[PDB]
Design an enzyme around this catalytic site. Structure first.
Site, PDB file in Angstrom:
ATOM      1  CD  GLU A 214      -2.949  -0.970   2.346  1.00 57.20           C
ATOM      2  OE1 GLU A 214      -2.890   0.058   3.061  1.00 57.20           O
ATOM      3  OE2 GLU A 214      -3.879  -1.744   2.368  1.00 57.20           O
TER       4      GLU A 214
ATOM      5  CD  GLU B 132      -3.630  -5.612   3.910  1.00 55.57           C
ATOM      6  OE1 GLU B 132      -2.353  -5.466   4.169  1.00 55.57           O
ATOM      7  OE2 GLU B 132      -4.565  -4.804   4.276  1.00 55.57           O
TER       8      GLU B 132
END
Lengths: 474, 474
Positions: free
Chosen positions: A166, A374
């Site tokens: 991320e 995720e």
């Protein structure tokens, strides 16, 4: 008539080191930028920090046996760079590598595939001190040294690797919103640090092709697919602007080695575009990943935003529903509530069809296999007498998302695996411990470590059944 | 704050041979599929056809003079394959060529840039008889030889070329809806012919690179950008399917040389995918164009369509407003009227912002410069005393679209040119003459063929001024 999950499908779960491990100063570990930042007053909910977390550094054997009981096929974890290099770029701390070797051997002895994330936000503080970490080109060769170290030690036993987890969040939160280290609010600085991180990503993928020729490597992008509010043409244009500026800005660099041009031009008009050196475009274009990693929680709905309009907005971190407000870029787009889906208490949208859409957009634009690194639901859980946690709400949210994953496979998207966030409950970076994501409840709260005991939630047994049936029973 | 139009911006206007030329059997011209098709009773409004049209084959010198007076920088027209090879594949017709040679010399001598469209829907009927025309691979080397002949004769004087014009329209209308030659309603045949048209496009681009090395070429795609009706996730998913199926299906083949997978897999599962031979992908991938041609008139809004729901629907070519009905593919998507724009009385969307969106989607997905090859408004014009056609409705439509092109250029899209549709009024394929598109009125209706005299409309003067101020005055 759905396609089945392929026979190799990696049914996983995930963590992040600073959120799980604890042992923040043990066995030679150096300080990370998070060890320092979470200790500054005010930065985190109730001063919660990762000194202990849920003590996974000491309890990894218990945790792994619980993964073996669940029957997990893969485990996604991050390596802490400060345990390996306490000063970021000096001599290696063998004790650091030995924890990860211990952890990896534990997984492989239980038949679990390790998925190693190289970077989950915890650059050593020494590198921040020396040259400002991600804001400096020096970090390219420093991240490289680190990544090769891990490739040479663990490459024979790990096939799946994630580079930057991320990047969009750690860069934007660290240099635009100021909510994460280094706590800066400067868009020019943001985009310069971003460019450097894109170069570091490329440099390590390139090194990986030499050191782990039979491995598979990708970045893990925090992907919130944009929707327009409606068919008003200005709203659709807002959607074009948003998907480009929020998603393509990163994913095109990852897949193609190029920034989109409308967004680049808009940044240039504002003096915000990054400094590009000779050789930058070449490096970036030559770093093709094996897959796009996708961390998915929600979609985002947008509408027209006049140039005199909304900018930063209020972020719900309490867990009081209805408290967030619109955010955007003046003249380009602003967010708005999607009236056609439910939201959580933290105002995150519940949109499992969105994941199908997201996976469809990535295949359609880049033709890349995806590893879902995720996906999960954060909520309050109640521990009932008899060590019982009835998390029906989590089972529902994971069921619907895994169902839509199969629809996407059926559509033709090559999905390599699914890692639920998280295996055990863990420390949230800014919101403490009460917003729980685990299959496995950890007995602690914001005030007390209690005994940190592991208690299997109802969702634990649901996912064990999903894995045993390869997705056929949800 | 707007960028200006560039200094070499090709301010243009456009025609199609069958729609304008007449001289259907002069100077050796063979039959085209439209010569035949149009003569069948039922097909065209009140039997209108292209034997005469507006007689541009005879009046071209008067026509290029009205161009020069308007000050056009370019004129887009199509070459009729049947004037050049009456048989499709036989001996060359030097008189057919000579007409085009005279047209190009006329245009050059008034400093107008010719844009030569190779194919606008008029394959010689002899090829349809000998081997099914577009349903056969034989049309590839025949189309090639035709194109190569034009490049050899005119390449030194024509820099801008379009290959296949609105390929999605001649394939769909011709092999699925049965409204154009060959009059078929068969999806399997549609997609086979489609695939062959793709290889033909590619082969001529590869020839062009050898015969016209300093020239520029690309296909022109009929683009209706898809919108989702709202942020309902099933509607956004519907928009993903619609944009891939309706638009990427063609544009990704033109830019990248590959079909999109989800669409391909849907076809494969219906038995509808085309037949592929050795070399197909290598040829398609190796035909990069210099630009993407775009014919734009409107956007389309879509919504969720159940597996049993709406299929093919009702068109409104009658001109009475409100009579169109939803068209779609069950399971994927169906159309719906966009409540945030106005429509014409033919239920077409008036959506100038829609063009900027479209132009933004092409640059974002493909990074290609765009040539706007057609945009315009069709309406009834009244001729009034003193040779006055007050086409305010048309000026207003065209003004808004040119305004939005400017915004796109300002966003950073490379728009090479703009060709309004059309220079003179002309023959519609199916609806006759009364829905006019011209800057120049032509004196004839559906019944009375009168004298075909050219009369400058109010919009001719408007656009003369636009060109004089290079877009500054709109």
């Amino acid at each position: 008539h759905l396609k089945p999950f392929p026979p190799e499908f990696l049914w996983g779960a995930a963590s992040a080191a600073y959120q799980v491990e604890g042992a923040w100063n043990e066995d030679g570990k150096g300080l990370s930028v998070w060890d320092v930042f979470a200790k500054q007053p005010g930065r985190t909910f109730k001063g919660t920090n990762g000194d202990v977390a849920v003590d996974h550094y000491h309890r990894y054997q218990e945790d792994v046996a619980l993964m073996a009981e669940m029957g997990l096929k893969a485990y996604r974890f991050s390596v802490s760079w400060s345990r390996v290099f306490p000063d970021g770029n000096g001599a290696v701390n063998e004790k650091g590598l030995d924890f990860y070797d211990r952890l990896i051997e534990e997984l492989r002895n239980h038949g679990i595939e390790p998925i190693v994330t190289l970077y989950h936000w915890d650059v050593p503080q020494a590198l921040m001190d020396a040259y400002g970490a991600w804001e400096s080109r020096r970090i390219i060769d420093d991240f490289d040294r680190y990544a090769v170290t891990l490739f040479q030690r663990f490459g024979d036993r790990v096939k799946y690797w994630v580079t930057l987890n991320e990047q969009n969040i750690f860069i934007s939160f660290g240099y635009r919103l100021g909510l994460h280290p280094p706590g800066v609010k400067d868009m020019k600085r943001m985009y310069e640090a971003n460019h450097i991180a894109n170069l570091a990503n490329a440099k390590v993928i390139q090194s990986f092709r030499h050191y782990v020729p039979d491995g598979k490597i990708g970045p893990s992008f925090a992907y919130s697919p944009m929707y327009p509010y409606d068919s008003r043409p200005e709203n659709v244009l807002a959607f074009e602007n948003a998907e480009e500026f929020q998603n393509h800005w990163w994913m095109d660099v990852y897949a193609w080695g190029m920034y989109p041009q409308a967004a680049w031009n808009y940044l240039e008009s504002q003096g915000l575009e990054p400094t590009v050196a000779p050789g930058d475009w070449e490096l970036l274009q030559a770093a093709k990943p094996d897959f796009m990693g996708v961390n998915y929680y929600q979609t985002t709905t947008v509408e027209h935003n006049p140039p005199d309009g909304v900018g930063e907005g209020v972020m719900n971190t309490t867990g009081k529903k209805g408290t967030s407000t619109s955010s955007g870029i003046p003249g380009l787009f602003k967010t708005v509530r999607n009236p056609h889906v439910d939201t959580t208490n933290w105002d995150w949208a519940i949109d499992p069809v969105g994941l199908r859409i997201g996976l469809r957009r990535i295949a359609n634009r880049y033709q890349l296999p995806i590893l879902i690194t995720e996906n999960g639901l954060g909520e309050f859980d109640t521990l009932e007498p008899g060590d019982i946690v009835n998390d029906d709400y989590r089972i529902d949210y994971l069921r619907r998302h895994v169902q839509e994953i199969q629809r996407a496979i059926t559509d033709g998207v090559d999905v390599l695996g699914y890692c639920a966030w998280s295996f055990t409950d863990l420390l949230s970076w800014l919101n403490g411990y009460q917003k729980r994501y685990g299959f496995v409840y950890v007995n602690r709260d914001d005030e007390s470590e209690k005994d940190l005991r592991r208690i299997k939630k109802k969702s634990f047994y649901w996912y064990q059944r999903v894995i045993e049936t390869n997705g056929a029973e949800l």
